[PDB]
């Protein structure tokens, strides 16, 4: 759904899916070719 | 006949100039990627 969402203090409006990217334990967020964010860890479940 | 024969000839050989050649179409290459980097660029200052 289109929602607003605040992740440890990032704040903005979007579309949250379930993600194929593979992070690294070590890794929280991820950007696209253009240092945009597209990708958070959530706090709670590690979810991506 | 001959005429013919070498109108064929070189139209064989447009076909395969440019499938050989990847230079051959630049202008038109260079035109989207001007309008490329145009747009990355202009996407990229958001982040200054
Ligand atoms: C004007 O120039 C053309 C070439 O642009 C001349 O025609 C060419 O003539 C040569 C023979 O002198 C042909 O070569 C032969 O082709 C046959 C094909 O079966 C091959 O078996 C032979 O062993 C030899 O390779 C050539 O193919 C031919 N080219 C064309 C496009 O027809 C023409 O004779 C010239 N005319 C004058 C008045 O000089």
Redesign the interface.
């Known amino acids: 759904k289109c929602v607003n969402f605040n992740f440890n203090g990032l704040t903005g409006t979007g579309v949250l899916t379930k993600s194929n990217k593979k992070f690294l334990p070590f890794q929280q967020f991820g950007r696209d070719?253009?240092?945009?964010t597209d990708a958070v860890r959530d706090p709670q479940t590690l979810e991506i | 006949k001959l005429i013919a024969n070498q109108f064929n000839s070189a139209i064989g050989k447009i076909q395969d100039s440019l499938f050989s050649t990847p230079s051959a179409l630049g202008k038109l290459q260079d035109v989207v990627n001007h309008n490329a980097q145009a747009l990355?660029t202009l996407?990229?200052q958001?982040?200054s």
């Open positions: 070719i253009v240092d945009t | 990355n996407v990229k958001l982040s």
